[PDB]
Amino acid sequence: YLVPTVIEQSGGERAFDIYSRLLKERIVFLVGPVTDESANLVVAQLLFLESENPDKDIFFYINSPGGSVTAGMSIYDTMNFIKPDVSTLCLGQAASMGAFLLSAGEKGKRFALPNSRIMIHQPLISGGLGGQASDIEIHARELLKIKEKLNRLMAKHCDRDLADLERDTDRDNFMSAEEAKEYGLIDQILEN
Amino acid sequence: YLVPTVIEQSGERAFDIYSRLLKERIVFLVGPVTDESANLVVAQLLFLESENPDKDIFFYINSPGGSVTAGMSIYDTMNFIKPDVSTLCLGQAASMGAFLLSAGEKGKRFALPNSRIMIHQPLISGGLGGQASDIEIHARELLKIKEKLNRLMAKHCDRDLADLERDTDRDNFMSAEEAKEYGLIDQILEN
Amino acid sequence: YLVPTVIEQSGRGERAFDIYSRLLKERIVFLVGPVTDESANLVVAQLLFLESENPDKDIFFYINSPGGSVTAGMSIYDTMNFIKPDVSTLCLGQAASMGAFLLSAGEKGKRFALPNSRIMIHQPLISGGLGGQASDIEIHARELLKIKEKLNRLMAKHCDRDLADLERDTDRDNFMSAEEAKEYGLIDQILEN
Amino acid sequence: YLVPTVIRAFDIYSRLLKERIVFLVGPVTDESANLVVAQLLFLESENPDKDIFFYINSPGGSVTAGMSIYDTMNFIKPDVSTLCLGQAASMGAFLLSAGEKGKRFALPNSRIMIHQPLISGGLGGQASDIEIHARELLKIKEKLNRLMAKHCDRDLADLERDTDRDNFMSAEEAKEYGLIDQILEN
């Protein structure tokens, strides 16, 4: 894709690609699958923005079907670590780790657009389970620990019991913005 | 493709021709609607609101359709931002492209005379594999999307939900005149 | 391909262009190869841009294309007719299918072809596949017939011919020399020097 | 490939375009032919009177693409001198012979090959469609032989014989035939 160039007026002019221009306004996009590379760019942007201004909010716009858990956790821990609040907004969809990162926004600053779709579910393969039964046992145990960790952190985000998240993430649980608000994944729904 | 470079007189500034048209508040949606192409539209819509919240934004659509969630990110951005988003159909506006065309500000939805506008119920929003329990869930989600799109279309067109349910059952191709009569667009441009 | 860079002389300094941006500065828009959403939208963007630079001066639309998408070609076609400045069209190498349509769509009196160019007109092929159920196939067959009639009707208008003539002549691939295209009514003049 | 930069900084091909040298290298395609046309148009304006040097190292390519170059060469006011480097085959030989008479050159060990066209496009579909495409190919065949015969100051009958099968010529044979005027050495 061709990323448009926009001109910022200053004290002179500076030409930006439109995403660098929005980063200047403390907007970080997570678009598409969560990968090591796309997650590390989010982390790099979150770290950069904290240094530019530790007190101002960071706006983390999410339009993602999910992705790697470890990659999503690098974002998650960076969001929680850095001093400035990270506000999260769901555009289009926030599914799987995308829904996790949406719910991970600062409480009171988690948003969704009216027709967005939010989906929560237990993790799938975090990696293949081949080799010997001993290796398969190890990977099955690691996946269960991740499953419990994600449900526990989700339950914390949503102010719900762990038992509720265990039921509700058993199979793909699709929610409207209103249902996500009632559930506790988001705080507000934007209109204008 | 090689995107031409044009010079803006102000000193001089060299733009690619699409950045030059963005300076005039023209946003293009060309080809399939994807997460990446939809997010560029959103980024441009956001950017233009900041430049001038009161001036209209011109959203030129030449698209066969694409992802519903990606199209909804555009749709909600169009409705959220303060400036009116005028929509124009070039070549075609099909599926989510027709939805976004109809989503333009009422009175400012345009089509060119020989454009083709097609509305239809959604197809797979994602595969339906796994167990019958998983297939049930995805079938239910697809039906909710189907109803949501028909409901929003009916609102855009000032028609009954029952009319959109009939008319989107199978691919419904319309000329610019038929789309105007239907309620998808307001005017047809000639000169 | 490597697109050459050329230097435009201004006052006491030089602006470096790629050779196509340099020719756009002279109001020359190229349509080369298949007509796609992307190649058609660049033509539209250039046509819109040129109208604003000067609404009165002619735009020169150089066509060397085997055809392509009808909807993509129609985005060019409607832009050509909409914008105030006349769009002169020139056939280089070939103008086939939608390329011939856009050639004939140039401003009457300003449609040109080079002496050894090849112009081919024909009814459309698949505008999209016809799978699914017989009900879906019926719908797509009807849409294709409407497009077929629309293209023949607009061609007949461009050529000052009867719709019946275009229906005969576009039944199968109809290849024409520049002279035959001029006699037919697709172009107005043939350039030599 | 990395195209060297030479000293404003040019890539070496833009630098040679500044000297009115246009290269046609490799197959003739819509894209490579349109760059030649764009360069020929550009050079005519920079100076309508000065010669343009069209260096050809090409196995052939599309006829319609080659004809866009051919008509541009004949249209623009400045003479287009043609030089064969390595090879000028098929439409490459046609464009070589299309240079301004007296200014068509070849290097001593270059190879020039002329032949009737192959498929200008597939011949599928119905026998009616195949008839149409066969007729169009024959018209192109006659047009190319006629223009070749004009370039070479030969009879159409001679080009029809000689282009029946791939006709390879040395620079000397191409000069005797009438495809080029001179052979360069130093």
Place this chain on the structure above:
Amino acid sequence: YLVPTVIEQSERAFDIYSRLLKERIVFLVGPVTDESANLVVAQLLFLESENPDKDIFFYINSPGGSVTAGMSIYDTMNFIKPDVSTLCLGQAASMGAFLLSAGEKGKRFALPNSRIMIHQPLISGGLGGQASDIEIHARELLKIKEKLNRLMAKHCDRDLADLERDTDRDNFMSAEEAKEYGLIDQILEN
């Protein structure tokens, strides 16, 4: 991916990774390859030159990779004068865990929900050819296995026998377990 551009006030425009390199942050993201390892080495060498005394921050989010490529990083980390602090983001597995544990003792960090995995090496290269060639490659792999366990045991202040047990099969650890094991020194929260 499009790498954002940021402006440093001093103006200088950087891509965001060059901007973070200016702050002595080196990223190892994804598999360890000759090319990704040599960039880390080039950055480590460059940063030592800029300031031999200041710490270098080596952020690791990697599933593993080539041993020889990881060893080029490892030896560069140990050679250069400035301390290399290591941080685990997302995961540090295989050679990624090795390089994490290779950070300066007292400056090895992990984020709270990171995953650290240690294991014996797999194929360092195929074992085809003749039984004599297979014997050679099997011996080289065993020497590497012992070298990695020995260096791991040194990093963790554990016995070689402990690393030999624990790296037999994929050993996944939370940040707390990695801290108790001796792979990291601290877990960051805020």
Place this chain on the structure above:
Amino acid sequence: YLVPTVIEQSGERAFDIYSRLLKERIVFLVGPVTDESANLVVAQLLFLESENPDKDIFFYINSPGGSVTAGMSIYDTMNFIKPDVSTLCLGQAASMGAFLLSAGEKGKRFALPNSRIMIHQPLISGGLGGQASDIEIHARELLKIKEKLNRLMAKHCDRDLADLERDTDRDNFMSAEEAKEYGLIDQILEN
């Protein structure tokens, strides 16, 4: 590959390292000889003649061979332009690479001590399909090329055509010393 950037002192000018070496009249032919790689050599040879018709051009060859017509475009350019083209073999000069090596100005053809130089008759200059009449034509053209290359090689090496016909029958590998004795190069560089 990432091509390093180097700074020339003059003010300063930043070059990629190959453009920097072209400034010193060094032209590289690396890898197979193709229409594109051969035309860059020709463009560089033409450019360097214009910069200074009298100074030598240094043509560094590390090539397994390639197209004959592409190699002949280089060969004729080398012989045409006024400045002497000195040739140096790095790594290898095989097939047309050996031809272009031997084509350097007599007395200025060099090889590095451990370079490998290989001469052989041409292979297919193009496939031989179609009808027996077409195969006859292409077989005749290949034989003419074979004779032309042996004749030009024999001229370069100050040998009889009969010697090159024997020696190019099958791949003939030579050390730098054997190539010097044969007549393909004039000197072997050490320091």
Place this chain on the structure above:
Amino acid sequence: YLVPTVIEQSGERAFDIYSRLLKERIVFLVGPVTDESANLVVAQLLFLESENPDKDIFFYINSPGGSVTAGMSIYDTMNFIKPDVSTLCLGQAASMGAFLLSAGEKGKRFALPNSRIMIHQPLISGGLGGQASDIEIHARELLKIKEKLNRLMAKHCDRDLADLERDTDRDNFMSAEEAKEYGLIDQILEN
């Protein structure tokens, strides 16, 4: 990969990090040795000699091997140019990578403590198809290369040719200490 940009203080000059290290006379050979990667090393070695014929050049090697002719272009350039070329093994120096490591200036060949150095006879320098006469020729050329490499290795290591012939028969993996004892490197760096 994205190659970082670094700023050199002088005014300021922005470099990619490899061009910045070339400014310090550091040349990297990373990954397989190919015509293209070998010619960049040669171009850098030639460039650095021009910048300062007296200062050492630092040639960092992290390579599994590659083409012999490509490696020989580096090897002859290293020996030809006036400045000493110091060699350092990072990660690994295998096959031609070990050859080029041993080819560094005697007394200035280094390895990092956990590097791996592997020496072995060459494999196919090219396929051996065609007729038995062609296979004989290519087998003879491969044997000449085998002998040349063992002879040059033995010279580098101050060992008998007979020792290298034994030791390169099958892949011979060495630690930095074993390579030092063998004679491939002179020192092992720690800090």
Place this chain on the structure above:
Amino acid sequence: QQALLKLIEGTVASVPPQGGREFINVDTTNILFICGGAFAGLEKVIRQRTEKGGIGFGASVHSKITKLFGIVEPEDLIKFGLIPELIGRLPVIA
């Protein structure tokens, strides 16, 4: 250039006295000014104006120091870099 506009056209200059820094009022109305210089970049401008031409088919392309300077016009001096208000005050170009 702007400051000179009112010195070349008649004004009353206020200049220091013959001693160290009452100022003297000088009416410049009748002072003749001869200005000159080597307008080094001026030939290219004249060639751009006199040999414009065009590129592309429909357009027509035009044919290509002493001669150029001899045909200098204010349009060239304006594009060169002099301001129209100063050019008009130098009515004679030699």
